[PDB]
Amino acid sequence: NAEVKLEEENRSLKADLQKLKDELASTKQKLEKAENQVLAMRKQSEGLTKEYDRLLEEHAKL
Amino acid sequence: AEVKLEEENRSLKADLQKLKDELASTKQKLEKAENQVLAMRKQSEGLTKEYDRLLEEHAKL
């Protein structure tokens, strides 16, 4: 029984391992998406700031 | 044959712990990232509002 019990437990733990791996994969993709969004918004912030600057430049030339 | 199964059992438990922790970390980082996204959206809105006000001021000639 020692060995059959160990088999039961091993299969169970392997299943748990797979479940956790799935969770980690999902969460990882979510994190990747959020990070990439952050970068995107850095670029966009830079651009928008540049346009705000264009306001001042153009006005300085009237 | 038993010692092998014991070995594997412990190995699997260790892997479990590692994954619990890695998942916890990843969730923390996801939370941080989403707060960053939110904050930056708000900064952007503030900036477009600033833009509107400034342009409206310039258009007053």
UniProtKB/Swiss-Prot annotation, chain B:
Disulfide bonds: none annotated. It is found in: Endoplasmic reticulum membrane; Endoplasmic reticulum-Golgi intermediate compartment membrane. It comes from the Eukaryota. Cleaved by CASP8 and other caspases. Residues 1-61 form a coiled coil. Ubiquitous. Highly expressed in neurons and discrete endocrine cells. Functions as a chaperone protein. Is one of the most abundant endoplasmic reticulum (ER) proteins. Plays a role in the export of secreted proteins in the ER, the recognition of abnormally folded protein and their targeting to the ER associated-degradation (ERAD). Also serves as a cargo receptor for the export of transmembrane proteins. Plays a role in the assembly of the mitochondrial membrane respiratory chain NADH dehydrogenase (Complex I) by stimulating the translocation of NDUFS4 and NDUFB11 from the cytosol to the mitochondria via interaction with TOMM40. Homodimer and heterodimer with BCAP29. Binds CASP8 (isoform 9) as a complex containing BCAP31, BCAP29, BCL2 and/or BCL2L1. Forms a complex (via C-terminus) with TOMM40 which mediates the translocation of components of the mitochondrial membrane respiratory chain NADH dehydrogenase (Complex I) from the cytosol to the mitochondria; within the complex BCAP31 interacts directly with unprocessed and processed NDUFS4 and NDUFB11. Interacts with VDAC1. Interacts with VAMP3, VAMP1 and membrane IgD immunoglobulins. Interacts with HACD2. (Microbial infection) Interacts (via C-terminus) with HRSV membrane protein SH; this interaction is direct. Belongs to the BCAP29/BCAP31 family. It is linked to Deafness, dystonia, and cerebral hypomyelination: An X-linked recessive syndrome characterized by sensorineural deafness, intellectual disability, dysmorphic facial features, dystonia, pyramidal signs, almost no psychomotor development, and hypomyelination on brain imaging. This is B-cell receptor-associated protein 31. It comes from Homo sapiens. The gene is BCAP31.
